Amino acid sequence: SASEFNILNDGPPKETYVVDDAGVLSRVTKSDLKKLLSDLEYRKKMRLNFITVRKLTSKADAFEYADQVLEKWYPSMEEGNNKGIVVLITSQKEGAITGGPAFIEAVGENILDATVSENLPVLATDEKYNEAVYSSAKRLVAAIDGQPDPGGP
Numbered sequence: 001s002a003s004e005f006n007i008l009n010d011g012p013p014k015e016t017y018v019v020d021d022a023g024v025l026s027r028v029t030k031s032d033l034k035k036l037l038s039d040l041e042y043r044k045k046m047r048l049n050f051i052t053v054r055k056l057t058s059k060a061d062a063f064e065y066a067d068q069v070l071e072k073w074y075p076s077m078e079e080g081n082n083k084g085i086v087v088l089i090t091s092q093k094e095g096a097i098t099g100g101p102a103f104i105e106a107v108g109e110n111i112l113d114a115t116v117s118e119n120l121p122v123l124a125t126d127e128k129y130n131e132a133v134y135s136s137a138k139r140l141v142a143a144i145d146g147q148p149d150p151g152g153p
Contacts, residue, residue, distance in 0.1 A: 001057040004065065012049055012073040022052035022090040024129035033137060040141050046103055048084040048140060049073075050133055055091045062087050062096030070098050086136060088120055090129065095120030095136075111143040118152030 003021050013019050017037040018030050025033070033050065041047050056065055066087040074080030077100070084099035084107070095116050097107075104112070115136045123132030131153075139150050 003053050004057060007051060007053065008069060008072050012047075017047075017049055018133075019049070019051045022054045022088075022129075024052050024090055025133060026130055029130040029134055032134060036134075036137055036141065040144065044106070044144055046082050046084065046106060046144055048086065048099075048103075048137065050086045050088070050137065052088045052090060052129065052133070055089060062089055062092075062094050063098060066096040066098040070100075074100070084140065086115075086120075086133075086140075088124060088129075088133065090124060093121050093124045095124075097140075107140055107143045111139060111149060114149075114152060115139050122153045 007019055007021055010019070015034070016030065017034050018025065020030065037048055051069065056062070058064070066085050069087065070080055070083065070085050074083050081100035081102045084097065084103040087096045089095070097112055097116055119136040119139060120132055123129070123135065135150070135153065142148065142150055
């Protein structure tokens with residue numbers, strides 16, 4: 001709960017694009033994520049955030065919390081329309097992605113749940129959190145830019 005609370009309380013990571021509460025991402029990867037993602041915001045006005053958490057206290061799943069985070073960080077249509085929230089539960093190897101309609105439409109449902117059922121669960125199961133997260137960001141960015149799908153792990 002302290003985790004679930006802090007993640008929600010400390011608003012969105014405006015400069016870093018990441019909240020690695022599970023502490024599974026390295027200095028370098030977070031750096032790469034920031035570079036990759038601030039470039040996405042600069043070019044497409046799409047704001048994509050990643051969150052890692054060890055586990056949820058609630059019986060609620062990843063999607064539920066992701067949506068709770070979206071609503072908290074961007075309480076209005078105008079503020080959240082172009083936002084994307086990716087949540088990764090490391091102890092469960094489970095992921096979720098939600099966001100505003102524009103973000104959702106710009107990515108598309110195909111890649112949306114492909115990322116969620118492939119990159120996140122598969123890579124995290126193998127303990128490769130950094131590649132789990134970076135490849136997911138990279139695959140979401142490709143979709144938004146209407147580039148070829150790199151595919152899953």
